[PDB]
Symmetry: none
């Protein structure tokens, strides 16, 4: 991506428009990450977040978010598991809310598709898929490159390419990661399954500790502090404040 | 493999077909793993699960499962040992059950065959062998690739290829692993021999502990939790509830 | 860069001109680093030092500094965030000061541009942008190269190149680093948020400690010791003694 | 090596011939390992096992074993050391037993020959030497390859090639290893010098625990458990039950 | 470099010329190291030893050393900083002494020059610059090669080239190192800023111990043990016994 | 190197010639190592062992060893330190002993000669130098290869090459090593400087322990145990029993 030099005098003179946030504390046009131990329901959280930005309700009750076309790229779930998740989520959506989501959200399954962002054709296809879109969700990043996630040089290139896409197209990119990467990224959120100790601080009890997860923004550089939230795993995995 | 975009409107409206499970909690068309030290009888367990999905009896008494053609690829056992394990298993089967196993099961020995899923001819061969099949069992994964099992990059390519074969042909793939794969595999089961501790918890004493192993599903995403199970090792290794 | 042999007798005789400092304890024409953890305010502190050297006011009350053209290269902030920082900073400047800053500061956004100092075009480009300038600020170094930041050989090459540019053009280079490449940079400054401990050695309870940061020069070779300083984070992020 | 698909029905019906064991618990035609710390007698034990299978006496008093041609490849002992070991062992054999050993045992010294199983000439050579033979002993594996023994990929290839030769020719291969080449090799045996503590459990005071070593099978899949054994290191190194 | 076989008989008969030491315990014609952190001021110490060997006074009061042409290669300091260091040191020298230093010392600045001893042109250049010279000081080694200072293989090549230059020209080479090399360098000296401990252990108080540094020879092979020494840091960094 | 198949019958019948030892417990025609920390006297010990084997006295008190032409390759000491070492040692030799050493000992200095056994010309040169010689000493191995000393694959190749030369020529090779390379070497010996412990155990108080070092064979596979010895460092380093 390229940029005009900043016009100092203008910035001084005109009070700027509020910062455009695609997600809590995440500036639109940048790259962010959603981290979690493979088993907390990152995919469901991302689907709901994507459904919201595409037009849907704020079921998760995180701030109200601006709306825009969203593209979700699940590379680790079979199409049928996606259908079931959507059907479940839908039970919480009105006829209007469902049509909104269907209107703004495109889900392109990629399981076994072998996307490689460092390869020409995939870089080009992802860039094009990002054009005119507000958010692009990669689930999970492990499936979009063949590099060692512990090597800072290769990862700088892989994250660089996503930044190049987000900056050029204006489409924000959020990748999911199975818990380096966190040190590169400027916005990072997490999801973690409730623990013993935690099941003994607000209430509840074990055997039931698996119907709850905590979400929160672990790292950001702008905006008011986002308060860690608790979510109850309803049927099919759908998440709600609770 | 390639996929069509999800019809979101449909998934929200129509009741989705129940998930097709190839194994307890494992969605058909995906990749899973059966983990264990190796001397816990992974091969025998795999052969019985393979025989059951092929059309055989539910000797292990795990759930009754949908049937379909199965191909088992043992790369670490000499043919003669495979013969011995079958003859032993055969004693637990009626003639009708034996014929059903033979009708739906193909066992292609590969010891010393040096298959490499990363090489073109083998990838092509493995994919063609997966066509029209419900399950393909790789025993063990270590013998189907020449990459560093500790390097997430090469392993993501290895596993990616299995997901490609599975998604493109609809044939589920389960590989045995002698213990990351834990992170990038959504279904994982395990087997572990009983030690001095467990023996002194259910009955039996040591010097008899070598006749017990517990199964159980270590990681899943969909379905009702699968309760661990204990099996006793009969003559020739055959496993039954007990 | 090249240099002629030192005229030893001439160095013995004439008391040399005072050492030209671009920043406290940093000799003009060299390479330096500003270190700090992801979120502490590196970017804002760097913009204020750059605005000061460009010709603006010494709002940080760090020593008065020689002025000259400055180029700031933010590769991690979306242009809009740069606008907000400038607008907030502008409220602390007179019309004259704003004009002076605009007359000497060039801010060229590079988010998603993927500059690589190891590649020839970027090397030549960075060097031409340095000509006739007093200070070049790289924010942050991680975005100006694709090497492993833990590999001393590649990092030696990356830093050698900044030194080649600085020695050739006389333009000092300061890079920001998200907290080894520290053993070799001769000038090093730091910025750290106020610890719970510190916020109870000077005043104000916690829940306030987040509005303060400590600056100080962590490593230098020339000059009178620079004293650590405390800054309060005013509206927009702007820093002032306080 | 290649194999015909298993005839499942024929395996169910016919009682298979007894499992052919080249060594206790080791199926003929497979690959196995003899493990121990550097100096402890791996070589003498290997030489006695090879002399036995070749047609010689069961001095070790391990089971009675099927005989057949054997080739022993010592790559770490000068020829003269081999002569000394044979001369000493010979003093425990009748003229008949000596002749029998010389009739079925071929010992081809390889010190400084640099065999590389990953290279074509050596692979072809090793394979041709295995043909028509019951057992091939590699002493020690470290000298038959130039790979990193800690790298699973390369070792999978090195081990795969021994499995190819064994499956193709019917000749079993046992390699010695100076203590992963364990999680994959199905048969594993060990030799450990007597503990500074193990003496105070069977008799014999210390400073004498050196003339003793214990044998035993560390890993297997078939056969009745093999009982660990103790051997006394007579003159020349020759091992007798004791 | 090449050498003729040692005449053994001769060396046994004829008494050998005393060993020629370039520095305390360092044999002329070899490679040595001066190690220290960052702010201990090894550049100044190096400049003084270099001035002394060039024909200057023994200001440090280490032993009296044979004189000869010296070339100093500072690759980490701007020329102006060198000018200042020389001017300061000069105030401690008589006219005659200054003249002597200028007569035997050549200081060629190399900051941003990117010397690489592994490259042909630089190897050749350093070699020619070493001819007819008694000492060559590299300040610091990190700036004369691009290899990983942790990798013994590359460092063995880096160090071997210095030894090649030292042996072929008779010019000793001493490189400074900011703290393996330690293991493969026969002569090693060090410098460390006085500790808070050593402070209240000699007669000095804190916030004043910053003016003290201990020198000493950390490793050698020949000669009378060199006693550690304490130096006080006067204006400009100049070091005197004190 | 190549070898004829062992003649089993001949070995059984003829009592073999005693094992030809080049050094205590080291069979002639093999590869061994002398290990020790940077400062201990390895080179003097080696020079003396070399002198003995070449014809000289058993100054060291180690048993009596057969004699033959020896070639010593010091790559880390300047020729002059060698002369001084020889001259010192010669003070303990008769006119006859000196002429003996001079007759069978060849010392070819290689400091800065950059030998690389993995390179064609050097391998060939080292082999030819080993022809018709009884011992070849490499001091130290670090200077004869450019590989990573803790990488088993490359080291196997480096050690393989020495074994190839020793086996093919009959010349034994001993390399010195600054303390992996022990797991591929069958004969290892060491030297350790007496520290504050063994001192207050065998006599001599500190301040005098630097004059003592203990020898001893850390690893072998043949022969009568060699007892750790103590040596007193005389003038010039010459080692004597004491």
């Amino acid at each position: 991506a390229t940029h005009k030099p900043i016009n100092i005098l203008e910035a001084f003179a005109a009070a700027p428009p509020p910062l455009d946030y695609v997600l809590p504390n995440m500036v639109a046009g940048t790259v962010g990450a959603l981290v979690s131990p493979g088993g907390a329901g990152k995919s469901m959280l991302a689907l709901q977040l994507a459904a919201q930005i595409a037009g849907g309700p704020d079921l998760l009750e995180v701030g109200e978010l601006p709306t825009g076309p969203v593209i979700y790229l699940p590379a680790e779930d079979p199409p049928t598991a996606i259908h079931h998740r959507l059907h479940a989520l839908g039970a919480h959506l009105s006829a209007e809310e469902r049509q909104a989501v269907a209107d703004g959200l495109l889900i392109q399954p990629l399981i076994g598709s072998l996307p490689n962002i460092m390869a020409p054709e995939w870089f080009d296809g992802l860039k094009r898929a990002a054009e005119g879109r507000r958010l692009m969700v990669l689930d999970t990043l492990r499936r979009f490159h063949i590099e060692e996630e512990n090597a800072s040089g290769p990862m700088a290139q892989v994250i660089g390419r996503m930044e190049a896409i987000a900056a050029d197209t204006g489409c924000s990119i959020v990748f999911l990661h199975h818990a380096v990467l966190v040190d590169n990224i400027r916005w990072q959120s997490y999801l973690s399954s409730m623990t013993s100790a935690e099941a003994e601080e607000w209430g509840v009890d074990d055997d039931q500790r698996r119907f709850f997860v905590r979400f929160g923004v672990s790292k950001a550089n702008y905006g008011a502090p986002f308060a860690d939230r608790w979510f109850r795993r309803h049927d099919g995995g759908v998440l709600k404040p609770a």
